[PDB]
């Protein structure tokens, strides 16, 4: 995996590659790692596919039940439900999740949850095996309050490099845009992002 979430002026965008691995064999070259736990609260999955799918399904169940009783949950609340599962089952899980969401009050927010189960609220976050190769690039190129087009370019260029160097990453670059306007899915194919 190479995954990232970036806040910008109008909200937040999640980004991911599409490669799933069992060794050197690419078990799925068109995987969807950007997952929906609520209308405008999504997550990026890295680590064990089984673990992150089981966790995401449980979180979706918790937030659906939260919504029926207390109305729309915050992104912070969603991150806390993720954390509770990851921390309390740290011995039996291998999951690195980035939580991203859009409120109207709080706007775009990003929370990263590494292996231990700790929570870290950040302006942007990167994770997965391929993220190691773009710490330098992302730190130099990230600005706060970017536009939608700038943020898409930042994520596209960043994951392009991650894919280029990390054998575990590859395929298409999926993205999900979260703003007041709604939810937009984007896809970018190899012929596009490789020539960058």
């Amino acid at each position: 995996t190479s995954i990232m979430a970036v806040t910008f002026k109008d909200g937040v965008i999640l980004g991911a590659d599409s490669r799933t691995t069992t060794g050197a064999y690419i078990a799925n070259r068109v995987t969807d790692k950007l997952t929906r736990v609520h209308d405008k609260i999504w997550c990026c999955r890295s680590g064990s596919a089984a673990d992150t799918q089981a966790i995401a399904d449980i979180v979706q169940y918790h937030l659906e039940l939260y919504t029926s009783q207390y109305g729309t949950p915050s992104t912070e609340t969603a991150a806390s439900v993720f954390k509770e599962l990851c921390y309390e089952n740290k011995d039996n899980l291998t999951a690195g999740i980035i939580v991203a969401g859009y409120d109207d009050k709080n706007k775009g927010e990003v929370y990263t949850i590494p292996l231990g189960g700790s929570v870290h609220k950040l302006p942007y976050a990167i994770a997965g095996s391929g993220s190691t190769f773009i710490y330098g690039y992302c730190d130099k190129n990230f600005r706060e309050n970017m536009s939608k087009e700038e943020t898409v370019d930042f994520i596209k260029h960043s994951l392009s490099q991650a894919i280029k160097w990390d054998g575990s990453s590859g395929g298409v670059i999926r993205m999900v845009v979260l703003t007041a306007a709604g939810v937009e899915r984007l896809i970018f194919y190899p012929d596009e992002y490789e020539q960058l």
Binding site: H62, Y66, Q69, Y70, P73, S74, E76, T77, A79, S80, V81, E84, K105
Partner: protein
């Protein structure tokens, strides 16, 4: 007959007489009130001085839940404490899982479901208290009142205990004369007056006034007790109105 001997038994009317008998214990208790103001809530209660040997200001009746919710009740005091203890557990588990402090409507249902559960079986007795509670959350101020049956609604003003009719009448005047709203400091003054006026039903023994409040501007949305100069100012305002 015999329908009133056991809890959770429907009478031929469709009534639970045991719950209705629990209300009698509430009506027997001291007067307590709640006032919803512009950016918060005010709670007040009548404390009967049974003897000179009672230490003033020490036997505190109003209780805090979490850091943003106040609870006051009339009837069997121990039952009220048991309910608040549950409320504190409910609020603790909510904040544990969801991070944010429990919203007041969410909290209201937690108590409601718990009180309602004690009308479902004959192995438990219904609660002998009506509880007035509320506070400030992300969506603003809320005031609730919860009965032995488990029934609760939101309120602009609320009152329960022996002097509830007197209090209710005074609260209804405030609602009519202030459609735009009441300030937090005004509500503290008005709360003092209403308890003093409601003390005519308990006129044999003298009493001690106790007030608390949550306000976005005055207390940063946290529950606090009214003390010292602000308490004395409210007592003076109250004493002036009865004369």
């Amino acid at each position: 007959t015999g329908y009133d001997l056991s809890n959770s038994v429907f009478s031929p009317d469709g009534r639970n007489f045991q719950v209705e008998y629990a209300v009698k214990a509430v009506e027997n208790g001291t007067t307590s009130i709640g006032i919803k103001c512009n950016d918060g809530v005010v709670f007040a209660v009548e404390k009967l001085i049974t003897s000179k040997l009672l230490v003033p200001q020490k036997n505190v009746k109003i209780q805090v839940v979490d850091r943003h919710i106040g609870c006051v009740y009339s009837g069997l005091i121990p039952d009220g404490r048991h309910l608040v203890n549950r409320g504190r557990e409910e609020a603790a588990s909510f904040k544990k899982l969801y991070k944010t402090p429990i919203p007041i409507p969410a909290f209201a249902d937690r108590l409601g479901q718990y009180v309602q559960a004690h009308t479902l079986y004959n192995s438990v007795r219904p609660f002998g208290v009506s509880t007035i509670f509320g506070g400030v959350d992300k969506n603003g101020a809320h005031l609730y009142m919860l009965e032995p049956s488990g029934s609760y609604w939101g309120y602009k003003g609320a009152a329960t205990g022996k002097g509830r009719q007197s209090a209710k009448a005074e609260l209804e005047k405030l609602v009519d004369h202030h459609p735009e709203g009441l300030s937090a400091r005004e509500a503290v003054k008005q709360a003092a007056k209403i308890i003093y006026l409601a003390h005519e039903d308990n006129k044999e023994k003298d009493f001690e006034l106790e007030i608390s409040w949550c306000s976005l501007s005055e207390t940063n949305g946290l529950h606090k007790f009214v003390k010292g100069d602000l308490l004395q100012e409210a007592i003076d305002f109250a004493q002036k109105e009865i004369n």
